[PDB]
Amino acid sequence: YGFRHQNAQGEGTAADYKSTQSAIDQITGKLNRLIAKTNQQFKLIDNEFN
Amino acid sequence: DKICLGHHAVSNGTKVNTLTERGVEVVNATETVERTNTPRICSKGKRTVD
Amino acid sequence: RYVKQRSLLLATGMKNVPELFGAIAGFIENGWEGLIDGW
Amino acid sequence: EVEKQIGNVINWTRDSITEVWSYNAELLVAMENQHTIDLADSEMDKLYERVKRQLRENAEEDGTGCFEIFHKCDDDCMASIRNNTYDHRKYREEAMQN
Amino acid sequence: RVKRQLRENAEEDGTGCFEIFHKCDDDCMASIRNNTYDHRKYREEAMQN
Ligand SMILES: *[C@@H]1O[C@H](CO)[C@@H](O)[C@H](O)[C@H]1NC(C)=O
Numbered sequence: 001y002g003f004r005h006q007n008a009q010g011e012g013t014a015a016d017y018k019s020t021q022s023a024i025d026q027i028t029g030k031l032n033r034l035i036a037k038t039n040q041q042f043k044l045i046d047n048e049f050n
Numbered sequence: 051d052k053i054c055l056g057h058h059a060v061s062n063g064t065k066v067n068t069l070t071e072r073g074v075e076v077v078n079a080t081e082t083v084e085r086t087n088t089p090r091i092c093s094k095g096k097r098t099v100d
Numbered sequence: 101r102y103v104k105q106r107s108l109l110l111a112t113g114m115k116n117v118p119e120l121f122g123a124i125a126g127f128i129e130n131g132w133e134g135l136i137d138g139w
Numbered sequence: 140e141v142e143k144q145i146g147n148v149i150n151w152t153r154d155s156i157t158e159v160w161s162y163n164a165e166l167l168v169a170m171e172n173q174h175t176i177d178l179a180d181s182e183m184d185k186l187y188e189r190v191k192r193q194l195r196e197n198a199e200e201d202g203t204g205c206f207e208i209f210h211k212c213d214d215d216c217m218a219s220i221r222n223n224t225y226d227h228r229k230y231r232e233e234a235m236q237n
Numbered sequence: 238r239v240k241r242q243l244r245e246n247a248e249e250d251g252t253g254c255f256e257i258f259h260k261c262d263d264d265c266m267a268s269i270r271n272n273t274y275d276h277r278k279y280r281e282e283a284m285q286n
């Protein structure tokens with residue numbers, strides 16, 4: 001999310017960091033919450049070769 | 051000459067997991083799992099045969 | 101799939117106010133019944 | 140001693156269901172916790188600007204949560220703001236030498 | 238956040254863009270972007286507008 005100005009001396013596009021890193025880590029929060037592991041181990045109940 | 055506005059806080063909060071954190075400090079909280087049984091077959095109103 | 105409830109109504113309109121953001125049942129008090137085209 | 144083959148099905152089934160509820164348990168709380176906090180933040184903001192268009196052409200702002208009245212407002216005037224009956228046209232004529 | 242920072246200074250159009258009412262060169266344009274614009278310098282001349 002950035003800025004853009006306009007005046008008698010030209011133009012200029014900047015950015016804004018505080019809001020940018022306010023947004024990235026929450027998705028990173030959602031990512032690291034979703035990227036997780038099962039601890040539950042399942043055996044062999046049904047045969048296959050007969 | 052000014053009328054500010056605020057909320058309420060305590061000294062010691064409790065730490066709860068939201069959907070985008072671990073451990074946020076929150077003014078009150080509530081247990082949702084049960085841990086303590088009663089070591090007795092509470093059999094009021096049922097004609098029990100041991 | 102078999103549930104145990106027998107009725108579970110699902111909304112498809114706004115809150116009915118006859119005569120999170122605080123305008124429907126908010127600082128606009130009542131609905132209109134004399135408005136029949138738009139919402 | 141339940142029989143071997145049928146006892147393995149029950150333990151398989153039970154621990155399978157156990158992963159389902161224990162998954163449901165912690166999302167239900169975490170989803171609920173998130174809505175609890177902005178619920179109390181929504182109610183903070185609705186109260187806040189309610190004072191603003193009540194003090195319609197009267198207060199400026201700083202951005203801390205605090206308004207700034209531009210004429211002498213003693214404690215009954217300070218009481219009339221807090222019970223939702225401030226009548227701004229009394230003061231609009233002298234909230235404009237400011 | 239830019240709006241009540243530019244408290245009695247900007248009008249609006251509704252595109253996402255403010256409209257300053259006095260000559261604001263690039264240090265003035267820099268003071269808005271780092272959250273330290275001090276509006277009472279300019280409130281006396283954001284009101285011939
Ligand atoms: C907070 O939650 C607990 C639940 O353990 C409850 O006993 C208590 O009344 C609640 N309120 C306050 C103000 O502590």
Ligand SMILES: *[C@@H]1O[C@H](CO)[C@@H](O)[C@H](O)[C@H]1NC(C)=O
Pocket residue numbers: 142143144146147150
């Ligand atoms: C099923 O699990 C229980 C422990 O939960 C164990 O005591 C029992 O032996 C298991 N059954 C078989 C057939 O392994």
Ligand SMILES: *[C@@H]1O[C@H](CO)[C@@H](O)[C@H](O)[C@H]1NC(C)=O
Pocket residue numbers: 215216218219222224
């Ligand atoms: C404030 O609100 C109360 C409750 O309606 C009312 O009785 C009172 O007259 C109001 N005004 C002042 C100045 O207290």
Ligand SMILES: *[C@@H]1O[C@H](CO)[C@@H](O)[C@H](O)[C@H]1NC(C)=O
Pocket residue numbers: 264265267268271273
């Ligand atoms: C803008 O912000 C930086 C960082 O605090 C500060 O050093 C600087 O003096 C500010 N003002 C201007 C005009 O750059």
